[PDB]
Design a protein around this ligand. Structure first.
Ligand code: A1LVB
Length: 291
C-alpha cells in the first residue's frame, strides 16, 4: 500500500458512450473530474503500468455512428493529458485486460458480430502489440484478472450463450487451460484478485443481472459464494484497493447505477461508500497515484 492512490473511472455508457475520466479518493470521499478521453468509449478496460493509466478498446456509440475501438490511450496523472499509443491488431469492444510483468494483455471482445477468442500483448517501452495464444473459448463481456503472474478469463458471452466457464493463461507455455467453471453463468461480471482468489461479482446470466459474488481459490480450484452485493449489477467497474473490492456503477435492468459498494473480506460484508457523479455502466477502472 502507498498514500495518494485514487480509483480512476474512464469512459462508460448512459444513452451513448462517454468520455469521462473521474477519480475517487477513498481517504476523503471526493471525486476529481480529469481530462476527457479523446474519443468517447463504452465497453473498454482500464489498467495501470508504471504509474500510467491505459484505456483499452471499447466502442464509440455516438449520434453519428457505432465504431468498435482498437485504440490504446495512456493518461499521465503528472500532466493530466491523454496520449495515443500503438493500436491493437483488431477492434475489441466489451474487452477484458490484465497486466503481467509490465505488459498489457487484451482479451477477447467483439468487432461487429465477430466474437474474439484472440489475445494480444502490449509492450509499453517498445510501444508494440503482438498476438499470443488465443483462448479456448470466444468471449465478449469477459472479466480478466491476474494473480501470481497467471492471467484468468472469466465468463462472458460467445454470441449464443452466456458462460459460467473460465480459463487461465500460463505465459511460459503460451497456453490457455480451462479451470473449474463458476457456479453461475456471468457475462459482464466485475473480475478482480483479492488475496489468493479470483472474484467474479455481478454480471448477467441472460435473464437477470446478478448481485451474487463468487471467488475461485487458485490452490483448491473451487468457486465459493461470498456475501452478495446490495445492488444487482452487470457491466460494472471493479478494482481492489487496500485489501477491499470496489464495484462501481453498472446496469440492473432499470437504472444505470451511480452506486459504489466496497467489500471487506475479513467481515464478508459490503458497504455503500460513495456515488459516482452520474449513473453509468461499461466503464474501465484502475488505481494509480493522484494527479
Ligand atoms: C461492458 C459489457 C459487458 C457485458 C455485457 C453483456 N450484457 C450485459 O451484461 C447486460 F446485463 C447489459 C445490458 C444493457 C446494459 Cl446498458 C448493460 C448491460 C453482453 C456481452 C451480453 O451478455 O449480452 C454488456 C456490456 O456492455 C453493454 C453496454 C456497452 C451497453 C454497456 N454498458
Amino acid at each position: 500500500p502507498k498514500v495518494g492512490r485514487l480509483i480512476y473511472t474512464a469512459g462508460g455508457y448512459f444513452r451513448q458512450s462517454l468520455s469521462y475520466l473521474e477519480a475517487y479518493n477513498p481517504s476523503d470521499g471526493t471525486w476529481l473530474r480529469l481530462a476527457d478521453l479523446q474519443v468517447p468509449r463504452s465497453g473498454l478496460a482500464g489498467c495501470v503500468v508504471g504509474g500510467l493509466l491505459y484505456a483499452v478498446g471499447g466502442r464509440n456509440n455516438s449520434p453519428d455512428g457505432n465504431t468498435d475501438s482498437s485504440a490504446l490511450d495512456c493518461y499521465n496523472p503528472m500532466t493530466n493529458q491523454w496520449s495515443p499509443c500503438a493500436p491493437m491488431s483488431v477492434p475489441r469492444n466489451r474487452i477484458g485486460v490484465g497486466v503481467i510483468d509490465g505488459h498489457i494483455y487484451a482479451v477477447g471482445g467483439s468487432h461487429g458480430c465477430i466474437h474474439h477468442n484472440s489475445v494480444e500483448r502490449y509492450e509499453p517501452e517498445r510501444d508494440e502489440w503482438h498476438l499470443v495464444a488465443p483462448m479456448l473459448t470466444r468471449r465478449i463481456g469477459v472479466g480478466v484478472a491476474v494473480l501470481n503472474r497467471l492471467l484468468y478469463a472469466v465468463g462472458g458471452f460467445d454470441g449464443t450463450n452466456r458462460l459460467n466457464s473460465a480459463e487461465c493463461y500460463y505465459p511460459e507455455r503460451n497456453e490457455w487451460r480451462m479451470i473449474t467453471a463458476m457456479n453461475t453463468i456471468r457475462s459482464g461480471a466485475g473480475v478482480c484478485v483479492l488475496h489468493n482468489c479470483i472474484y467474479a461479482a455481478g454480471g448477467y446470466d441472460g435473464q437477470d443481472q446478478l448481485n451474487s459474488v463468487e471467488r475461485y481459490d487458485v490452490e483448491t480450484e473451487t468457486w465459493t459464494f461470498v456475501a452478495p452485493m446490495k445492488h444487482r449489477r452487470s457491466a460494472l467497474g471493479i478494482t481492489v484497493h487496500q485489501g477491499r473490492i470496489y464495484v462501481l456503477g453498472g446496469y440492473d435492468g432499470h437504472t444505470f447505477l451511480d452506486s459504489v459498494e466496497c467489500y471487506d473480506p475479513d467481515t464478508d460484508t459490503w458497504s455503500e461508500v460513495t456515488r459516482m457523479t452520474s449513473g453509468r455502466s461499461g466503464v474501465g477502472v484502475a488505481v494509480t497515484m493522484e494527479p
